[PDB]
Structure 1
């Protein structure tokens, strides 16, 4: 099955993130399912190394855009699915306003029946008493627009957006995302006209779970 064919039903997901922020090292594993026909994810993440040194919401965008719902008239613009099963590399720079920066590199691809997202994350120049290392971010998420454009030279796409993180004092912590994706195989892909992804996400907990963790529900639809 190739491209969009791999997403004609519920697909199991494995996510693994190795992170290092200001020298603080942690690992997160996530598992669950995605249904691209309706643009839906259901995931549970565990911090296997103990309590995270950063707030869970700062990791959400790093922790599978192939599961976005692309309506039929837009299927010709679905770079993410078109790269499957071989997959794509996803890199970002994330600038937390008045604070540090995340640099991330990931491979998103099928390993057998499972869609896997393996990530390496760096965090630099974070303030010890800032919102991130100070854990002042609310455990929730907001709704965003992800702008996507083609990158013909690299046979891929670029994306940019700003995440809004609610701070415990009512303020909002912005995080500017700059994104590049490039196919792993060689490996023809869909190169899209400009469009966007509309995102909505809920962060919850598992009442039976004692480990530091995050339950995530996400709905994303392509438009424009």
Structure 2
């Protein structure tokens, strides 16, 4: 159909991540489900190459924007991109550390959104908290969504990770979501997506197994009018 019509039911998803950090190759496969009206969903991820050679925390954003809950007043761009699908190009630059560059494509097969991601994690510090797995949690944040020409939206974020030492590791997140079709698509005005994440290490024998939950919902913050009260 077109857009949200296709998300009025319970859905699933599958993710394949092709990655490398500092030259070390890794593979992640994940799946989960999201039940209408969405905005609170879980993912079960497995490192198919064994032990993840970095913290799982910075993986959080790689392992579903179309499953955020949107208000009626804001066009849900990520949902509207279907059936043609969407691409995502993203950088997260960590202060005093490496930068993750990812390229994502999303496709809908029935009620399953399949994602294929390539990711390059370059110039990470071997003795920093990312490579030494010293990130403890993932801070809640208020991502910013901006129109980005006639066929895309830009998502800007500050993704902080608290460290064992009690400090913060800050990533500067810059993501472009692009519509893959030729038909005219509505581009939402500026808005926000609150994102709350919790990751859990699961029973794992030879492969890392991590569960992650995310609550994600949009809001806006509208203008003021009178400028003397």
TM over 0.5: yes
Secondary structure at the counterpart of residue 162 of structure 1? strand
Conserved? CA contact 1:89–1:105, under 8 Å: yes
Q: Could you list the per-position Cα deviations for residues 80-135 of structure 1 after superposition, in whole angstroms to 9, with x for gaps in the alignment?
A: 10001221111111101100111110002213331111100001111111111122
Aligned to 1:61: 61
Aligned to 1:205: 201
Secondary structure at the counterpart of residue 138 of structure 2? coil
* Structure 2 alignment gaps of length 5 or more: 221-229
1:37 Cα offset (Å): 1.3
Compare the two structures and name the one with the higher helix fraction. 1
- How far apart, CA to CA, are the structure 2 residues paired with 1:199 and 1:179? 15
- How far apart, CA to CA, are the structure 2 residues paired with 1:196 and 1:72? 14
1:36 Cα offset (Å): 5.1
Determine which of 77, 93, 103 is the counterpart of 1:105. 103
Residues 148, 42 of structure 1: CA spacing in aligned structure 2 closer, same or farther, 3 A cutoff? same
- How far apart, CA to CA, are the structure 2 residues paired with 1:104 and 1:38? 25
- How far apart, CA to CA, are the structure 2 residues paired with 1:5 and 1:35? 14
Mapping for residues 1-150 of structure 1, pairs under 5 Å: 1-35=1-35, 37-74=37-74, 77-138=75-136, 140-150=137-147
Conserved? CA contact 1:36–1:66, under 8 Å: no
Secondary structure at the counterpart of residue 93 of structure 2? strand
Conserved? CA contact 2:2–2:80, under 8 Å: yes
Q: Could you list the per-position Cα deviations for residues 151-200 of structure 1 after superposition, in whole angstroms to 9, with x for gaps in the alignment?
A: 125x1111111101011111110011011111112233220110000111
Max Rg structure: 2
TM-score by length of 1: 0.93
1:62 Cα offset (Å): 1.8
Conserved? CA contact 1:64–1:108, under 8 Å: no
- The runs of at least 4 consecutive aligned structure 1 residues that moved more than 2 Å come to none
Q: Is the counterpart of residue 191 in structure 1 residue 157 in structure 2?
A: no
Report the number of matched residues.
219
Conserved? CA contact 2:91–2:101, under 8 Å: yes
1:219 Cα offset (Å): 0.8
Aligned to 2:224: none
Q: Could you list the per-position Cα deviations for residues 28-63 of structure 1 after superposition, in whole angstroms to 9, with x for gaps in the alignment?
A: 000110235141211100000010111111111122
- How far apart, CA to CA, are the structure 2 residues paired with 1:52 and 1:151? 34
Secondary structure at the counterpart of residue 132 of structure 1? coil
Residues 135, 158 of structure 1: CA spacing in aligned structure 2 closer, same or farther, 3 A cutoff? same
TM-score by length of 2: 0.91
Conserved? CA contact 1:149–1:193, under 8 Å: yes
